[PDB]
Design a binder for this molecule. Structure first.
Ligand SMILES: CO[C@H]1[C@@H](O)[C@H](O)[C@H](OC[C@@]23C[C@@H]4[C@H](C)CC[C@H]4[C@@]4(C=O)C[C@@H]2CC(C(C)C)[C@@]34C(=O)O)O[C@@H]1C
Ligand SMILES: Nc1nc2c(ncn2[C@@H]2O[C@H](COP(=O)(O)OP(=O)(O)O)[C@@H](O)[C@H]2O)c(=O)[nH]1
Ligand SMILES: [Mg+2]
Length: 819
């Protein structure tokens, strides 16, 4: 319990300050460990409440300990800011913001589960902020009580967990920081049980056995970990796990640190009442009062807390190893600062100079009980902030030249953020964490306060600006459609970054910048904008139905009358030609002569075939054609309209599963009609032509084509590797890798492989890659559309079931009428 004066005095010696947080996978004990720290060293002031965002700890080290600190120290008192970090670990920017205001981290790892993805994710983000890590292998009690594990097994488990961790560190830590790996012998690894309240470092044991083995602890802690053995027979320390005779030697870690602990557990839990007093006496543990009566776990919990208080182990690593702001801001300055590295503000950050202009980073806005008011939480990197001080509030889009996001206003009050409470203070110098009241309106989320007109903004969060996340929206009650269509308009108008359009398959699509953005949009659309139950789902992907080769044999079909017959074959239309039709070089209404000259001279077509195209389809202009190759059919001219109409019908609804055809050419080889027009009416010939077309189609090695996106991704070099990793998992294909900004990888990504892509990409690039996608072209899947188990077939079977059609695709024989 300190007074505002004591706190302010503590905050002057930033050399003795430690800004850090606890990194842990859910359930690994992050909470009970901080409760332990708070109960042991928490600080409290000697009716407005807030959400606990940070806690202050106080610690004193012995004069000898302080000498061991490899960094500028002023006295034996230390102020530790334990900063709260979100629990969402998706490489989110909320987490990055929280870490940004810290310099060191206490990483919690489970004895049994070891390092899990969640752990790797926050640690990776932390390393990206040049944060120094220190580890605590937690839940050790489980291995002793539940699993009955042996000393060497426990050792091995510890060593493997430490290795897993230093793999992540060696991979993502900036080489400029040197070796930021963790070493038990150097005291950067603690072992214990946050629930039982005990933990230790090799250092503490070295201190305990140094003055006992007649050796300095520097020598002792190297010997208390890894391959160091003490042969009681020779009384010597060696690095060989066997003696001269070759007999097995027990590792020093097991023999001097684990065994005493193992013996305490075994004796106390088995009620060996004549073995416990001696063991406790030897370890110099003293039970007082009612404690002398405890037994079992109760006695154990109490004995271990006295023998190795947890908080003590943790505070030791924090003070001795985690960097102070002075130490850290020296190598973190440039990243933190967007401006010039030679800039006056950057230098003030490197020096953690309290007399320079203000450079205060706003980490986030915290909820208070002061009727809808949010206090700004952050860290003073340069200068000192004062109550009633005129400062310059610069949002995420501010630039020294423009007046965007700029907001000059006085800071109403500077408060200490102590748990759920606040404490008004007059000022706060560089190196400290602090809360600002009165910044609510001008800043929401991150920002940057300065007292210099030149001041550049501190590292801002990079956010997506492309509608890469999209879903299909539909009313649960058909009659509501009008409100939905209206709601989308209202939604679009209110949000610049939101996009809505109708898909090729007839679904309303709503797309957002990121998953979160899209979620707000859908919530607002459903609740306000449209105000009606909406149904959300992955947009249906549209496909095309084409042929890979000519009909293996003439297609023959007759009319209902059985009097008329059409003979035809289908063949592929070249992509360049389909494209030419789709894009305007070859047009439905152009003069057939000039068009045929182009198709023949420039595209390899036979000019007679070209001069004889009867129509394009579907809709009279699609990339499918009917060419007349008949020789002496008498009443040909009279059935033309029926044939054309049937084609518009056939190309609009393919026989594979009802999708439109594309790149399909149909050659009419011959037609036999009835002499009297009354048996050659459209009602007779339209079905014939459609039936024959479907047959020629199916006889031409049918295939479906899928939509393919052109995806453009901006990101930093070291992250590019994740891009290729994801793409390869999604039938992707790289197109171009260009560039002294970032990189930009361009690739083709099948549309049916893009649902959730944005998520898997941030996950594979540590949230550093930013996707952009636009429809590019159609691609023919080589697999059999009629084989329910091939890639194409699965897609066809899913669409058929979804539409209530029979599963089996009718084969060509179903449309062929034998002579
Ligand atoms: C500017 O934003 C763009 C990009 O997001 C992208 O080009 C997107 O693509 C939409 C699709 C466009 C394709 C062409 C019209 C023909 C095939 C169409 C698609 C159907 O599967 C592929 C993509 C993704 C779609 C379905 C799944 C919605 C498309 C559609 O509109 O149905 O369109 C919007 C407007
Ligand atoms: N056996 C054991 N359980 C623990 C230990 N520390 C925490 N737990 C338990 O693990 C669960 C999650 O703990 P908590 O501190 O909330 O973890 P967090 O959510 O990651 O912060 C709770 O049921 C705890 O009682 C420990 O050292 N040993
Ligand atoms: Mg917790």
């Amino acid at each position: 319990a300190f007074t505002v004066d004591q706190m302010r005095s503590l905050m002057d010696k930033v050399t003795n300050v430690r800004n850090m947080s606890v990194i842990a996978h859910v359930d690994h004990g992050k909470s009970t460990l901080t409760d332990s720290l708070v109960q042991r060293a928490g600080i409290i002031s000697a009716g407005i409440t807030i959400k606990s965002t940070a806690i202050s700890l106080y610690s004193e080290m012995s004069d000898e300990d302080v000498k061991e600190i490899k960094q500028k120290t002023d006295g034996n008192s230390f102020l530790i800011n334990l900063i709260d970090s979100p629990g969402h670990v998706d490489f989110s920017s909320e987490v990055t913001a929280a870490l940004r205001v810290t310099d060191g981290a206490l990483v919690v790892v489970d004895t049994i589960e070891g390092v899990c993805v969640q752990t790797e994710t926050v640690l990776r983000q932390a390393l990206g902020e040049r944060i120094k890590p220190v580890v605590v292998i937690n839940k050790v009690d489980r291995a002793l009580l539940e699993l009955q594990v042996s000393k060497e097994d426990l050792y091995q488990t510890f060593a493997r967990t430490v290795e897993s961790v230093n793999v992540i560190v060696s991979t993502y830590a900036d080489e400029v920081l040197g070796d930021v790996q963790v070493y038990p012998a150097r005291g950067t690894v603690a072992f214990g049980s946050g629930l039982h309240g005990w933990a230790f470092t090799i250092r503490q044991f070295a201190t305990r056995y140094a003055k006992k083995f007649g050796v300095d602890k520097a020598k002792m802690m190297d010997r208390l970990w890894g391959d160091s053995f003490f042969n009681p027979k020779t009384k010597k320390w060696t690095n060989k796990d066997t003696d001269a005779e070759g007999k097995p030697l027990e590792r020093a870690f097991n023999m001097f640190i684990l065994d005493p602990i193992f013996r305490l557990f075994t004796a106390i839990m088995n009620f060996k009442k004549d073995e416990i007093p001696v063991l406790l006496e030897k370890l110099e543990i003293v039970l007082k009062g009612d404690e002398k009566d405890l037994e079992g776990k109760a006695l154990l919990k109490v004995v271990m807390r006295k023998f190795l208080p947890a908080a003590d182990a943790l505070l030791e690593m924090i003070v001795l190893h985690l960097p102070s702001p002075v130490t850290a801001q020296a190598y973190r300055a440039e990243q933190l600062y967007e401006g010039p590295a030679d800039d006056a503000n950057c230098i003030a950050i490197k020096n953690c100079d309290p007399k320079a202009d203000l450079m205060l980073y706003v980490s986030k806005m915290v909820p208070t009980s002061d009727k809808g008011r949010f206090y700004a939480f952050g860290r003073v990197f340069a200068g000192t902030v004062k109550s009633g001080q005129k400062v310059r509030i610069q949002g995420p889009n501010y630039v020294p030249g423009k007046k965007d996001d700029l907001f000059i206003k006085a800071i109403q009050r500077v408060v200490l953020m102590m748990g759920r409470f606040v404490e008004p203070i007059d000022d706060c110098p560089a190196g400290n964490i602090i809360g600002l009241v009165g910044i609510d309106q001008f800043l929401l989320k991150t920002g940057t306060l300065t007292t210099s007109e030149t001041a550049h903004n501190m590292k801002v969060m990079k956010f997506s600006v492309s509608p890469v996340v999209q879903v299909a929206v539909e009313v649960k009650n058909a009659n509501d459609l009008p409100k939905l269509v209206e709601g989308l308009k209202r939604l679009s108008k209110s949000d610049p970054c939101v996009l809505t359009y109708m898909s090729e398959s007839g679904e309303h699509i709503v797309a957002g910048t990121g998953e979160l953005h899209l979620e707000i949009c859908l919530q607002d659309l459903e609740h306000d904008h449209a105000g009606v139950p909406l149904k959300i789902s992955p947009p249906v992907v549209a496909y095309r139905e084409t042929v890979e080769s000519e009909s293996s044999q003439t297609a023959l079909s007759k009319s209902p009358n059985k009097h008329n017959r059409i003979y035809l074959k289908a063949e592929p239309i070249d992509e360049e030609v389909s494209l030419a039709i789709e894009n305007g070089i070859i047009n439905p209404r152009d003069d057939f002569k000039a068009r045929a000259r182009i198709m023949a001279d420039d595209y390899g077509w036979d000019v007679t075939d070209a001069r004889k195209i009867w129509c394009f389809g579907p809709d009279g202009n699609g990339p499918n054609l009917v060419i007349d190759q008949t020789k002496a059919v008498q009443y040909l001219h009279e059935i033309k309209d029926s044939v054309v109409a049937a084609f518009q019908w056939a190309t609009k609804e393919g026989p594979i599963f009802g999708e439109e055809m594309r790149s399909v050419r149909v050659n009419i080889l011959d037609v036999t009609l009835h002499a009297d027009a009354i048996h050659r009416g459209g009602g007779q010939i339209i079905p014939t032509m459609r039936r024959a077309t479907y047959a020629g189609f199916l006889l031409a090695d049918p295939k479906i084509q899928e939509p393919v996106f052109l995806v453009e991704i901006q990101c930093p070099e070291q992250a590019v590797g994740g891009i290729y990793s994801v793409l390869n998992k999604k039938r992707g294909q790289v197109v171009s890798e260009e560039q002294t900004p970032l990189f930009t990888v361009k690739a083709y990504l099948p549309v049916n492989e893009s649902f959730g892509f944005t998520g898997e990409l941030r996950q594979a690039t540590g949230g550093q890659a930013f996707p952009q996608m636009v429809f590019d072209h159609w691609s023919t899947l080589g697999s059999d559309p009629l084989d329910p188990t091939s890639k194409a077939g699965e897609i066809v079977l899913a669409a058929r079931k979804r539409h209530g059609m029979k599963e089996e695709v009718p084969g060509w024989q179903e449309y062929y009428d034998k002579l």
